[PDB]
Amino acid sequence: IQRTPKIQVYSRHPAENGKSNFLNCYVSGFHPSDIEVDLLKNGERIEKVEHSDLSFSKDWSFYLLYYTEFTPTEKDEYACRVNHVTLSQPKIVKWDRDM
Amino acid sequence: GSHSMRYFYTAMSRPGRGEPRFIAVGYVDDTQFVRFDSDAASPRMAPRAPWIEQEGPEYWDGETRNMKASAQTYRENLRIALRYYNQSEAGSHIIQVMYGCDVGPDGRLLRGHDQSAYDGKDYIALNEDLSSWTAADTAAQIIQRKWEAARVAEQLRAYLEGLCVEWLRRYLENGKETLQRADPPKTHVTHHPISDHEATLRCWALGFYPAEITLTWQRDGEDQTQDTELVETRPAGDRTFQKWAAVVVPSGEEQRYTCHVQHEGLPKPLTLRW
Amino acid sequence: KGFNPEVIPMF
């Protein structure tokens, strides 16, 4: 009945090591609206994360964009961590620069 | 449909955590331009695109007053819905509303919209005639009778055919540099071996506006509908959108695959191969 | 510009 979030993790621009970019976590297809989303750098929570205003699709499911400025490197790991009523535990999705 | 204007309200009860939150956003096409959040330190209707900023105090005050009156009404509607569904005052529930107008290239009304949901399920909708209602269940039939008696559809029709279209046209003029500009997708194909026997071909579309796009993979000119992984179109955060479509292909057969891209900003559809 | 009726419709 309740709907679990789909999660995409990706950059605004094609990733180029050492160049400033934006890390995005797009959560969509969920209901109800309350959702907890963190962006992580090597497992730790990034503090400066903004998000879009709550809106919804034609099927009434919600969507939100969370984002932060980042400068990717070869070694740094980025992830989005999401909790919602529908999840027994937080789901962690790693940024893959090819997706 | 050349352009649309939509307002979306979400009203969310939260027993024990104060009054239901009310969040409203307005869009022209795929561009947000206002929002309101009853939880903000100072709730008002606030600009979210530069072309709306020029509207004067009377505009912002009037929209603010509307959103405040609307937050109060949707709080009462949450209370009513609880009675209509025999539900307890202890659970959290959500009402959503969408309404707006679509105009063609010449700016005349193509069609109007006003639909409501309760807990993510269709509740009642104004029909395309802008005169009658479709109710999803016996609770919404109660509302339907009330709205029929009060001639509510007539009030929506007058808005949808009048102010909605006139203000949409105003916004499209004020925001013409962006609202009336399609940005075509930047496209390419990437190739990702998975084993000695298979590889993924991924067809990318980046930096496009508006969001509507079609990406399709053909093998020997036949659409691979059942075998294509398509991701949901996603915002880049700079107004534009991104999408990809991927197929797993036998090694040595990559050249039998073509990606086809349709978007309003393209003079003609694109065909890519790896 | 949002829909702003005299009386906002109740369920």
Do residues B95 and B230 share a domain?
no
d(CA B114, CA B120): 15
Do residues B116 and B189 share a domain?
no
Give A98's contacts (C-beta < 8 A, 6+ positions apart): B190, B192, B202
B221: left (phi over 0), alpha (psi -120 to 50) or beta: left
**How is the beta sheet containing A44-45 ordered, strand by strand?**
A44-45, A36-41, A78-83, A91-94
Domain boundary among B165, B181, B197: B181
Chain C: give the shortest CA distance to residue B119, in Å.
15
Do residues B197 and B141 share a domain?
no
3-state secondary structure A6-73: EEEEEECCCCCCCCCEEEEEEEEEEECCCCEEEEEECCEECCCCEECCCEECCCCCEEEEEEEEECCC
Which residues sit opposite B247 in a β-bridge? B201
Q: Which two tokens stand for residue B194?
A: 């998975």
Number of domains composing chain B = 2
Contact C2 B143 (CB under 8 A): no
Do residues B56 and B170 share a domain?
yes
Contact B159 C5 (CB under 8 A): yes
Q: What are phi and psi of B168, to 5 degrees?
A: -60, -45
Best mutation target among A8, A55, A85 (most B Cβ atoms within 10 Å) is A55
The SS3 assignment for B115 reads strand
**CB B91: neighbour CB atoms within 10 A?**
11
Sign of CA dihedral A51, A56, A57, A61: positive
Burial annotation B118-133 (CB, 10 A radius, 16+ → b, else e): bbbebbbbbeeebeeb
Q: Are the CB atoms for A75 and A67 separated by under 8 Å?
A: no
Distances (CA, A) of A75 to A18, A42, B103, B122, B200: 11, 9, 50, 47, 25
For residue B143, the chain C residue with the least C-alpha distance is C11
The SS3 assignment for B172 reads helix
Peptide bond into B210 cis (omega under 30): yes
The SS3 assignment for B104 reads coil
Residue with tokens 């909708």: B125
Give B263's contacts (C-beta < 8 A, 6+ positions apart): B182, B184, B185, B205, B208, B212, B213, B214
Task: Look at domain A1-99 and name its CATH class.
Answer: mainly beta
d(CA B114, CA A18): 48
B5: enclosing H helix or E strand: strand B3-12
CATH number of the domain encompassing residue B194: 2.60.40.10
Q: Which two tokens stand for residue B220?
A: 């020997």
Do residues B62 and B143 share a domain?
yes
Q: Which two tokens stand for residue B22?
A: 């009310």
The SS3 assignment for A2 reads coil
Q: What are phi and psi of A31, to 5 degrees?
A: -160, 135
The SS3 assignment for B74 reads helix
Q: Which of A39, A42, A35, A34 is nearest to A50 (CA)?
A: A39
Resolution (A): 1.9
Burial annotation B229-263 (CB, 10 A radius, 16+ → b, else e): eebebbbbbeebbbbbbbbebeeeeeeebbbbbeb
What does the DSSP 8-state code read for residue B195? S
**Ranges of each domain in chain A:** 1-99
Which residues sit opposite B245 in a β-bridge? B203, B230
Chain B residue set in contact with A, beta carbons under 8 Å:
8, 10, 12, 23, 25, 27, 32, 35, 37, 48, 92, 94, 96, 98, 117, 119-122, 190, 192, 202, 206, 231-232, 234-238, 242, 244
Q: Which of B37, B43, B41, B40 is nearest to B23 (CA)?
A: B37
For chain C, the maximum distance between any two Cα atoms, rounded to a whole number of angstroms, is 23
Chains contacting chain B through 3 or more C-beta pairs under 8 A: A, C
Residue with tokens 């005639």: B129
Domain boundary among B157, B181, B205: B181
B140: enclosing H helix or E strand: helix B138-149
Q: Which of B152, B157, B149, B120 is nearest to B136 (CA)?
A: B120
B143: enclosing H helix or E strand: helix B138-149
d(CA B117, CA B9): 10
For residue A50, the chain B residue with the least C-alpha distance is B237
Structural domain range at position B219: 182-272
The SS3 assignment for B76 reads helix
Question: Regarding beta strands B186-193 and B133-135, do their DSSP bridges make them parallel or antiparallel, or are they unpaired?
Answer: unpaired
Q: Which two tokens stand for residue B24?
A: 């409203």
CATH number of the domain encompassing residue B67: 3.30.500.10
Do residues B160 and B201 share a domain?
no
Contact B117 A33 (CB under 8 A): no
d(CA B225, CA A39): 34
d(CA B78, CA B82): 6
B56-61: long-range contacts, CB 8 A cutoff, minimum separation 24: B59/C1
d(CA B98, CA B9): 7
**CB B2: neighbour CB atoms within 10 A?**
14
**Which amino acid is residue B126, in one-letter code?**
L
Do residues B223 and B173 share a domain?
no
d(CA A66, CA A93): 13
What does the DSSP 8-state code read for residue B209? B
Q: Which of A12, A60, A99 sits opposite B120 (nearest CB)?
A: A60
Domain boundary among B166, B181, B196: B181
